[PDB]
Amino acid sequence: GSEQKKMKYLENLVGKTPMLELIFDYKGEERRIFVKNESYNLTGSIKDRMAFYTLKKAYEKNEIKKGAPIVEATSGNTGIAFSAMGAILGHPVIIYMPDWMSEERKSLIRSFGAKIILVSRKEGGFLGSIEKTKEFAKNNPDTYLPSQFSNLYNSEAHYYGIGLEIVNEMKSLNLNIDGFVAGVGTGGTVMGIGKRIKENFSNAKICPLEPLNSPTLSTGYKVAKHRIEGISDEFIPDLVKLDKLDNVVSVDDGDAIVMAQKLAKCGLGVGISSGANFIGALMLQNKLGKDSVIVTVFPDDNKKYLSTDLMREEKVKEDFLSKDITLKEIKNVLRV
Amino acid sequence: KMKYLENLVGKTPMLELIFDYKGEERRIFVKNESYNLTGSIKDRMAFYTLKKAYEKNEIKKGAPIVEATSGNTGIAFSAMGAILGHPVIIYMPDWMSEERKSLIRSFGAKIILVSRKEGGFLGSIEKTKEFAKNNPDTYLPSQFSNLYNSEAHYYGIGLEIVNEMKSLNLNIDGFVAGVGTGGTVMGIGKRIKENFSNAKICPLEPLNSPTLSTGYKVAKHRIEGISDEFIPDLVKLDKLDNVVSVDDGDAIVMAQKLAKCGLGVGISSGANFIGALMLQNKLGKDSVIVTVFPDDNKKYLSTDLMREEKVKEDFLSKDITLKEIKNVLRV
Ligand SMILES: *Cc1c(COP(=O)(O)O)cnc(C)c1O
Ligand SMILES: *Cc1c(COP(=O)(O)O)cnc(C)c1O
Ligand SMILES: [Cl-]
């Protein structure tokens, strides 16, 4: 080949992230959770694995030509990841997002060479941001649409990549996996990792996670704004197939923030969705038994969240799990 | 012990970058050090310093770790300090990017900003000694003089460099790195010279504040992480080859180009790229030059990196065009 050569080496920019064994007290019995740290990636997120897999398989299946624009609707880690990997592969990148999105998001995505097209309230969300991507393709037929919320390459990325890493590294510790939890944005993470884990541990519980403040998985709908950036921003996406998963876990965004704060104070600088996943995983442990082996992921680091409530004191509410959690140690770290 | 905590640092990607320089094709090789616990090369050094300190009982259980930083070292010691159960107290000049202050505080460290009136970098260092004098159990990693700093890079990143270039059957002709503490250049340089006695090991300075090359001149500059108002004891300019000098404007424009090609890096990464080119010009078109990208662009959104830089006539970046990533290695 040659393109094949290129894709073989560019994959060294993504994956092979640390697996961490985190020990903590939960009122006040000793527990542990296993977690992948996905900050160790090209642009700092799990979405790098997904963007790379997507573009690679698309090249393999001749579904994108050289120099073709990559076009998507997002303001988060997906725009960042396709912007960077798009530029690496010689593609201009076009991102549609709403016109009230913060300066910080726009500047970071702009840094990576993408063209940003802003959509107003009146031009329709949000939902109309994904509509203009479809318009663009019909007027420029070389357009590749990642279609993150519906594209099987997304879930597959995590089946072939991070999911397999998880099964391999838990097997090297001779630990069976009793469960896995992940917040759903596109759903690619929970679906892909779940498919992989359930091939190896048929009784594993694969629980998708939503915010209690906007339970898009349990109701179907975008109910309200919440502060768990990267998860449930729109509608149960087409990729998520709830029937193939076990029961929905719900976490309050404040509880996620406090948990992420605690994580940073033990030297793990993570995003709000990571704190959510940690709480998520503990909930699942609480259903299965204190000593069950539960895995999750930390999808990004804390550096993009330095003006969010991650930086402020959160009111502790009755039902927060995080008020009864004290982190003790990183007991082990695996890197394969 | 932490045979296992070392899995949080190091083993980062080596990139082969192809570019045009007015208007000839060239390449340089670069370690991407964002792929580390806190997103910087300093993670390697913080971990190694603490591991040795523990080995030689230079640090007591729960004792405070206290340090002066341009940002990344404090971030790194706040994260690793927290992991190992230590209070951390960081002094940092007040003109470093505000994202630095926020991250240090997120890791549970006490952060004290130090003004130019209060002596900037030299003042920050003295405040660390003051704290140690006042509080007898204090551990001072003293990154500006501690040989563990350069040792960390001799054993870690330096050895990865040598093995990665060996794997390409390529001889290293030169290495360039901006000097903050001097750890990076001294430690990598020692390792490279053991394997290529003729390789040139070049420290880099801002052209705006050429302290290494003059021995005295200190001025404001925006190349965060390097040129900290003095020549650090760790750096031995007579054991290194000649100083390379890059304009902070030229560095920023170069870091901006790198991000447009997919490599979101800090201002000093831009500086190092231009430096490695300036060295390449000395040794030949075809010479094999290695450098490092110490961190990513996320701590710099508040800085001139995100603004439109006045290009000048003498910027090498006005004549650079990035072509592609030709290769990526990682063991
Ligand atoms: C995208 C994203 C998620 C959700 O992952 P999906 O695979 O899209 O479900 C969680 N956290 C962060 C920070 C993200 O960017
Ligand atoms: C510390 C630092 C440097 C300089 O490295 P030394 O090993 O201290 O010479 C360069 N760039 C950045 C971003 C840094 O934090
Ligand atoms: Cl520093």
Side-chain angles (χ1 to χ4, degrees):
Chain A
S2 165
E3 162 196 310
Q4 192 180 128
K5 235 183 132 292
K6 188 161 218 198
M7 297 304 187
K8 165 80 176 295
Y9 76 63
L10 286 181
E11 87 178 316
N12 295 322
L13 299 174
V14 300
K16 309 164 247 83
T17 60
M19 174 70 88
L20 291 21
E21 185 190 358
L22 307 181
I23 293 189
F24 58 105
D25 285 343
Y26 182 60
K27 40 163 158 175
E29 55 184 66
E30 184 180 283
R31 312 291 200 84
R32 65 170 172 185
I33 293 295
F34 290 87
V35 315
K36 291 283 273 181
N37 196 332
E38 297 295 319
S39 80
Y40 289 76
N41 269 299
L42 183 64
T43 65
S45 91
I46 198 175
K47 304 297 163 73
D48 295 310
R49 293 174 176 261
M50 189 268 278
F52 176 68
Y53 186 85
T54 290
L55 296 179
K56 177 179 168 179
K57 179 162 184 175
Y59 266 64
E60 258 162 49
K61 291 261 284 255
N62 299 99
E63 312 170 323
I64 183 176
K65 303 198 212 155
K66 191 212 93 82
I70 302 162
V71 185
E72 180 60 303
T74 174
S75 57
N77 282 324
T78 300
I80 294 167
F82 280 98
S83 297
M85 190 50 74
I88 286 167
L89 295 163
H91 306 267
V93 178
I94 321 288
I95 307 299
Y96 290 82
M97 69 180 75
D99 63 6
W100 63 83
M101 296 295 107
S102 75
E103 104 285 17
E104 160 166 18
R105 327 311 292 183
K106 289 188 284 179
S107 66
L108 189 43
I109 287 165
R110 269 188 291 102
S111 76
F112 284 107
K115 313 260 104 189
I116 294 182
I117 296 179
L118 298 178
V119 190
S120 68
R121 317 252 177 184
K122 312 102 82 102
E123 295 168 316
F126 274 130
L127 259 308
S129 291
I130 87 103
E131 178 52 35
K132 292 213 187 189
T133 64
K134 285 152 147 151
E135 291 165 38
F136 192 89
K138 280 154 217 200
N139 289 119
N140 313 254
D142 300 357
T143 291
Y144 189 78
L145 288 167
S147 313
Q148 62 178 314
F149 289 109
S150 54
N151 187 345
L152 281 183
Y153 291 8
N154 181 352
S155 62
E156 284 167 32
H158 301 314
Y159 174 83
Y160 289 112
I162 188 178
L164 181 55
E165 287 179 27
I166 284 156
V167 167
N168 292 334
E169 61 227 350
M170 300 309 293
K171 193 161 270 106
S172 77
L173 306 168
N174 315 138
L175 303 171
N176 277 59
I177 295 169
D178 297 307
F180 174 88
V181 179
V184 165
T186 70
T189 295
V190 75
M191 295 298 315
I193 294 170
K195 187 185 163 174
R196 178 69 71 164
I197 290 176
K198 282 236 256 182
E199 288 179 359
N200 291 90
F201 303 101
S202 48
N203 293 325
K205 298 291 191 219
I206 320 297
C207 296
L209 175 155
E210 74 193 346
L212 194 57
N213 323 65
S214 188
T216 57
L217 312 184
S218 60
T219 71
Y221 309 104
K222 168 135 189 205
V223 164
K225 297 205 222 245
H226 60 89
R227 306 165 289 165
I228 314 172
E229 296 185 49
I231 67 163
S232 66
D233 71 354
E234 217 71 50
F235 73 144
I236 22 175
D238 177 303
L239 265 188
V240 181
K241 255 69 160 123
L242 292 162
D243 40 306
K244 273 71 146 201
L245 304 171
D246 300 298
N247 284 315
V248 174
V249 305
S250 292
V251 180
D252 181 279
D253 69 3
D255 202 10
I257 286 167
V258 165
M259 197 59 237
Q261 285 167 345
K262 275 177 198 257
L263 287 165
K265 278 187 200 280
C266 85
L268 303 176
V270 299
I272 301 156
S273 80
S274 306
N277 287 348
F278 189 94
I279 290 312
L282 177 54
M283 290 174 169
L284 184 61
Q285 200 173 68
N286 289 161
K287 308 203 259 206
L288 302 188
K290 63 233 185 227
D291 297 317
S292 63
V293 172
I294 311 290
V295 185
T296 189
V297 307
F298 292 165
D300 74 355
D301 75 14
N302 59 340
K303 291 188 180 60
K304 298 184 305 293
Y305 307 104
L306 303 182
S307 68
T308 74
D309 291 339
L310 193 48
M311 306 291 100
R312 291 178 269 285
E313 289 152 23
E314 269 296 301
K315 174 60 79 86
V316 176
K317 307 217 284 147
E318 254 310 301
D319 297 350
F320 283 10
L321 285 76
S322 61
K323 77 192 221 294
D324 300 313
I325 286 171
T326 309
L327 303 177
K328 293 286 258 228
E329 54 164 359
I330 306 183
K331 172 61 174 181
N332 192 13
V333 179
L334 275 176
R335 195 91 182 262
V336 172
Chain B
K1 42 79 252 129
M2 344 105 150
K3 204 80 182 66
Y4 72 68
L5 301 170
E6 88 192 300
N7 293 318
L8 297 171
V9 305
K11 312 295 192 179
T12 62
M14 176 69 98
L15 322 162
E16 180 183 7
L17 309 179
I18 306 316
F19 62 104
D20 281 346
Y21 179 53
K22 39 166 243 228
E24 186 176 53
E25 203 189 65
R26 275 123 175 277
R27 56 158 189 194
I28 65 167
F29 290 88
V30 300
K31 294 285 274 172
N32 193 328
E33 295 293 316
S34 74
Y35 286 70
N36 269 301
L37 186 66
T38 71
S40 96
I41 202 177
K42 305 294 167 67
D43 288 325
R44 293 170 174 269
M45 189 271 314
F47 169 70
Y48 185 87
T49 296
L50 296 179
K51 184 175 177 293
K52 294 292 295 178
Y54 269 63
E55 272 162 31
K56 307 300 288 184
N57 311 272
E58 294 157 25
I59 184 171
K60 267 62 65 65
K61 196 258 260 300
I65 296 165
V66 182
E67 182 65 288
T69 187
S70 61
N72 277 321
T73 287
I75 286 167
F77 277 120
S78 310
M80 192 59 61
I83 289 164
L84 301 174
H86 296 278
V88 183
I89 296 99
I90 301 300
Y91 305 81
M92 182 171 65
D94 69 7
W95 67 82
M96 304 316 300
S97 82
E98 171 51 69
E99 293 90 328
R100 291 157 151 76
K101 186 183 156 148
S102 297
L103 287 164
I104 290 165
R105 172 175 82 263
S106 80
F107 286 116
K110 260 36 127 236
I111 176 64
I112 297 96
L113 302 194
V114 174
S115 66
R116 289 179 190 285
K117 251 211 210 181
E118 294 168 323
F121 282 99
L122 294 169
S124 295
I125 293 166
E126 293 305 306
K127 280 170 184 295
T128 70
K129 298 176 180 163
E130 264 208 287
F131 191 104
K133 222 288 198 109
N134 295 329
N135 308 100
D137 267 18
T138 288
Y139 177 72
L140 294 178
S142 320
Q143 64 167 156
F144 297 95
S145 49
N146 190 338
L147 282 164
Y148 297 156
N149 177 168
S150 58
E151 254 174 55
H153 300 307
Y154 175 77
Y155 287 118
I157 192 177
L159 184 59
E160 296 175 13
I161 289 170
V162 166
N163 292 333
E164 285 152 11
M165 301 308 293
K166 225 266 151 179
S167 84
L168 300 176
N169 291 292
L170 294 172
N171 269 37
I172 295 167
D173 296 312
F175 172 85
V176 184
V179 171
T181 63
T184 298
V185 78
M186 289 299 299
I188 294 172
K190 189 186 189 219
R191 176 66 72 172
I192 293 174
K193 271 238 189 137
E194 280 176 358
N195 296 90
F196 305 99
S197 53
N198 294 341
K200 278 249 330 196
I201 309 304
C202 297
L204 178 150
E205 63 177 14
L207 185 63
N208 327 67
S209 179
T211 316
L212 302 185
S213 65
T214 58
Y216 67 85
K217 187 149 200 85
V218 173
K220 295 167 103 196
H221 73 86
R222 299 165 294 168
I223 313 180
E224 303 194 33
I226 74 167
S227 201
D228 301 338
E229 298 175 316
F230 64 113
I231 299 176
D233 285 356
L234 236 195
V235 90
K236 301 308 187 172
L237 291 168
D238 303 338
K239 261 111 168 221
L240 299 175
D241 303 297
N242 305 107
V243 174
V244 154
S245 308
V246 179
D247 190 276
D248 67 354
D250 199 14
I252 286 165
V253 175
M254 194 65 234
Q256 290 172 338
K257 281 184 203 258
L258 285 160
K260 267 174 147 57
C261 98
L263 298 174
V265 299
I267 297 162
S268 80
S269 294
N272 284 356
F273 189 104
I274 288 156
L277 176 56
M278 297 169 154
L279 192 53
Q280 189 170 72
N281 296 346
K282 274 182 223 191
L283 303 79
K285 304 111 288 186
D286 45 4
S287 57
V288 176
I289 319 305
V290 178
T291 189
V292 301
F293 293 161
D295 66 358
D296 82 12
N297 59 347
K298 290 192 182 70
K299 288 193 311 289
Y300 303 88
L301 308 179
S302 68
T303 72
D304 285 1
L305 184 61
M306 280 25 262
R307 299 183 180 107
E308 286 170 17
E309 186 65 28
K310 205 159 120 293
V311 169
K312 277 135 166 232
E313 178 75 312
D314 301 349
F315 283 10
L316 288 71
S317 59
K318 82 194 241 281
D319 299 325
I320 296 165
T321 296
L322 290 174
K323 282 229 128 117
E324 59 173 25
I325 297 161
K326 168 69 150 110
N327 202 1
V328 179
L329 287 68
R330 210 164 165 198
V331 311

